[PDB]
């Protein structure tokens with residue numbers, strides 16, 4: 001059965017340390033860049049409101065067959081009837097799925113059991129589990145989960161500090177320095193359910209990324225430090241399907257699912273974490289990462305530059 005990787009670093013900044021994100025990330029870099037990912041727990045009283053337009057939040061999530069790679073059928077291409085949800089109806093679907101799957105209330109399922117079952121299902125040819133992921137929804141569509149002082153939605157006085165906070169993902173620096181910048185980006189949202197997942201990838205331009213879980217059940221992460229990027233890529237090339245081996249990285253990353261224990265057996269260092277509601281995850285430049293959701297949740301993410 002699955003062997004959990006060692007835990008990545010978790011930081012609990014004081015209010016003083018919590019003042020500036022880029023200063024804080026710069027200070028923790030000597031350790032966190034050696035693990036690829038780290039988790040940051042804000043001070044206990046730092047609790048931003050949830051500011052999305054919930055009434056109108058509608059989306060068509062994408063369908064994920066956990067074992068699609070292992071399975072490489074009559075009338076393939078039509079495996080699933082298409083479904084549009086609201087935030088509420090997706091959550092009802094997500095909770096019903098998980099409680100039915102495990103035969104217990106959703107919050108009673110141990111995170112280690114969901115993790116073991118996820119990786120079993122990914123390699124299982126005997127059972128096809130299909131889930132849905134509201135992934136990569138633009139914060140321009142229904143707003144960011146953070147309050148934003150753009151005049152589209154009311155901000156209460158006690159919420160203004162969150163609209164102005166440097167840890168608000170809309171206030172992260174995103175402009176890369178370049179000559180072209182002198183001659184010539186917003187956060188993205190992820191509505192998760194149990195087993196919905198993201199496969200191994202790095203960011204465009206080897207960017208940092210930061211990720212905030214607004215609410216819901218945890219998001220389970222795996223990260224690889226940048227010093228092992230080429231090692232991971234070599235294991236991928238050895239073990240990825242031959243048909244996808246020659247593909248450019250930007251396309252291969254759509255289907256680079258791989259059990260962390262396989263990477264660890266080939267000597268790749270892997271760290272894990274459960275990101276809980278109200279916690280940040282930072283990924284460092286060229287740090288490969290992947291993960292899955294434990295249940296119904298809502299995350300926001302952006303690439304930033306230093």
Ligand SMILES: Cc1cc(Cl)ccc1COc1ccnn1-c1cc(C(=O)O)ccn1
Pocket residue numbers: 062064133135136190197198199203211219289291299301
């Ligand atoms: C297009 C897409 C579709 C699906 Cl089904 C899933 C993920 C994506 C893109 O995901 C990402 C792109 C760049 N980073 N990134 C990402 C996503 C998560 C997360 O899901 O929480 C975590 C960390 N990084």
Ligand SMILES: O=C(O)CCC(=O)C(=O)O
Pocket residue numbers: 197198199200201253254255
């Ligand atoms: O596209 C997918 O389904 C995989 C998710 C992901 O993180 C990626 O595309 O690199």
Ligand SMILES: [Mn+2]
Pocket residue numbers: 201202203209289
């Ligand atoms: Mn990412």
